[PDB]
Design a protein around this ligand. Sequence first.
Ligand SMILES: [Mg+2]
Ligand SMILES: [Mg+2]
Ligand SMILES: [Mg+2]
Ligand SMILES: [Mg+2]
Ligand SMILES: [Mg+2]
Ligand SMILES: [Mg+2]
Ligand SMILES: [Mg+2]
Ligand SMILES: [Mg+2]
Ligand SMILES: [Mg+2]
Ligand SMILES: [Mg+2]
Ligand SMILES: [Mg+2]
Lengths: 287, 127, 110, 109, 52, 95
Amino acid sequence: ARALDLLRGLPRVSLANLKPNPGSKKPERRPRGRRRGRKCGRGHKGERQRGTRPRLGFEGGQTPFYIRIPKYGFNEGHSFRRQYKPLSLNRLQYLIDLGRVDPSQPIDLTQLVNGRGVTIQPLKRDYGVQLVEEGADTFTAKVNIEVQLASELAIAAIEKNGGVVTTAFYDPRSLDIVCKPVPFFLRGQPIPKRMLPPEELVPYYTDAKNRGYLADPAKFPEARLELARKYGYILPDITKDELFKMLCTRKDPRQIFFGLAPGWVVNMADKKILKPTDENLLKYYTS
Amino acid sequence: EFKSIYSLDKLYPESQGSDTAWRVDIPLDRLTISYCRSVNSKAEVRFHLATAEWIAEPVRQKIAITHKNKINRLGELILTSESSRYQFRNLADCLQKIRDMITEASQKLHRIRIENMNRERLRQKRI
Amino acid sequence: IPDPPKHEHYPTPSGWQPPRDPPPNLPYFVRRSRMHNIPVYKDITHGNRQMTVIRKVEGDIWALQKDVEDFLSPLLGKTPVTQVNEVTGTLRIKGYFDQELKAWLLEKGF
Amino acid sequence: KNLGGKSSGRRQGIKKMEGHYVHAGNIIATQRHFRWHPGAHVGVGKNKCLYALEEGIVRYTKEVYVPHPRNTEAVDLITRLPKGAVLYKTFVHVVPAKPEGTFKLVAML
Amino acid sequence: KNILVRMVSEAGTGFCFNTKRNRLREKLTLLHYDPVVKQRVLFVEKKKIRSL
Amino acid sequence: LTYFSARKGKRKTVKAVIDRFLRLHCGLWVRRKAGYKKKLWKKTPARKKRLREFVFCNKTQSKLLDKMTTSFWKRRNWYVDDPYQKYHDRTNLKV
RNA sequence: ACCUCGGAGCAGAACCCAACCUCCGAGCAGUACAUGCUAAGACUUCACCAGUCAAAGCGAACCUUUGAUCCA
RNA sequence: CCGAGCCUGGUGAUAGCUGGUUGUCCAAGAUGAAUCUUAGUUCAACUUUAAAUUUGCCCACAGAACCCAAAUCCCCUU
Ligand SMILES: [Mg+2]
Ligand SMILES: [Mg+2]
Ligand SMILES: [Mg+2]
Ligand SMILES: [Mg+2]
Ligand SMILES: [Mg+2]
Ligand SMILES: [Mg+2]
Ligand SMILES: [Mg+2]
Ligand SMILES: [Mg+2]
Ligand SMILES: [Mg+2]
Ligand SMILES: [Mg+2]
Ligand SMILES: [Mg+2]
């Protein structure tokens, strides 16, 4: 570059040559001199020069605007509402295309987070990911994806491309562990059980039309055929697909990770998995 | 593989085979579907009504009568949906319209009525 | 960040396209972002000043500015107003042209 | 001993002078009593405010006033006029600007 | 004076609406449109809400 | 309000605002009209319809509410079936 | 004595204009019980709060002033 | 120095009240509503800065009420 040649010509760069980028350092304004002194920009007498003007929102005694408006339950229970980060099929296809999400293996929340396709904040009442139909008309990826919510159209697109989608619930603790497993493994605790959905969410995850992970698998072919009929595509028989085993793999309802069972301890330091053998512990972790 | 008391096999013992979850009327091959990215897109479904063997003959006749306004000069019924940004939903609407037309075939106008009545009242001259 | 997998056909269903090989012989080069996307970004200030920034430019940023002005004047009808940050190697154009500039840079093969 | 009388003005009067372009529903003039009468494509509210019923140009004209016969007091007032006399009033009209629609080619069946 | 009273639908619906009737006047029975039923039905005065 | 709390040193939220106003993420504040539940028997149907409406706030009112609430209340919330999901963003807005 | 709201003059002709200013009036009634629901576009008491008008549409039919929030 | 002692502490009490508020230089910059409120404050108006894009002021003709003047409003041009 010509800039480096200019450097070669110029004096040595040292700590005596350094200057901040112009425009990055505003001058400091302080109350000395004619223009900034005297009353120092505070006005003349009154509470505003004395520095004691009333609180924010006080209107001089008139009933404040923010108090004369009636209370309404706009934000009632806001902190207990479940939140689901949207994952559009556009974003999913983008991730698959750039190789940040491998469709050759089951796609769950862990894989999405590892590919950085979605950011989950369990502390902010994120209960997982919801599939979003946006980008359905251009989705051309065969994928086995596990999500928490799924729109009918998103399910239709996933299935038309020959893939499988299942809606799986996660309690806040299991969700935290799934999103960031490595910190959990460093906590040194046995992998906990995945709790069941709350009573209100039970019907959703037991319904086959949602591909609920607790729904009767006998009803899945009927629902898939119904979607294929409704949206005018021929349902591909995934059993014939050479990735049928992958498309079928589903973690157990009480399982957080695909190949790890509740109660196991992951010793990452020496690449081992300690498994309890006590009958009571095994019964607990299987229940 | 791990299995808990809530495993699917235990929950629904009747359906336990893996193939049970994946074991599979308008002919989509017979229909001709086109998409126009016209904001909502548009999906057009057109099919030759007369040669629609998948539709009964009386149903074809009743459709050709009731919906003659949607039939091209080539005798092909054309119908479109433009009510969604998703061509999936547009095509779904078109297919549902086809189904509704078949079902109904199986089983402002006030001023027009008045003016036609007046035409018939004026209809008095006989060669 | 993984290198994007080789695809048989481009553009990819999401629309992504790798930079052509060999690189174009233009006086300037626009390096892709670490995500392997074109570094063209919308920007907004004051709630009404809409700008588009071509950020990772190497070489003759002034040649790039001339090319951008030529490409955009017919769209606007007037020569677009721009700022060439020769230091940071960026080009800032008044108005939103992110999609058009992305398509144009793809055509040029960056 | 004189109380009250501190009521503020009602800010009434013409909101759209002649020639002003007016969209449907715009209030043209608010009056306490009928200073201006509704003309063509101009409606009247409960409170005798004039609003545009179509999108167009506001015009003010003077026209002969023939009240609704059910308006008994006005009819009597007319009954007391001499033969040549004709009452007049100021009327507000909206001259509609655009046509109410056009026929477009949709499909070349 | 007048009193605000709660006319309750005689159609069995939980629908009620408030009317104004003179205190000295007899209890009110009135035809009114019931949204749930979607039909005009009788409403009977149940209780006095307030005195106005 | 409290600009620096005595226990955390943080800025506090005026919960009276949270009990009354909905913030749309784009920067708009929605509210109910005052008196919408008061003495409806003496209000005309048009007035009742006007009062039953959800209404936006001024620029200065919105700025005041923004000052009186903290950044937690000004985040994207992806609720399941939020009735205001569509209203959380602006479209076709020129300046 | 007054404190809120409204009408007239001051303030003659878009709007707006004070007072211990000159006068007057009101804290509702009558009516019906679509005097319903929705909704373009507007007005606005110089802020906000509040207050007005309203096409189209749906539904029956074929109206002319007082006060917030919280709390119950 | 007692209509309620003195000292220390809370305490840097509080003060819508008075006083004070320190380099140079340039630039823009002036007269309603509510309020235990009129010695204050909040909103407006004005004002300053930065930004966007496109009309802004002046403005003739035409136009703006019956009852019972000076002027004003409105806007093609310029
Ligand atoms: Mg000075
Ligand atoms: Mg001083
Ligand atoms: Mg002061
Ligand atoms: Mg930025
Ligand atoms: Mg007066
Ligand atoms: Mg106003
Ligand atoms: Mg002593
Ligand atoms: Mg002090
Ligand atoms: Mg100067
Ligand atoms: Mg008070
Ligand atoms: Mg004071």
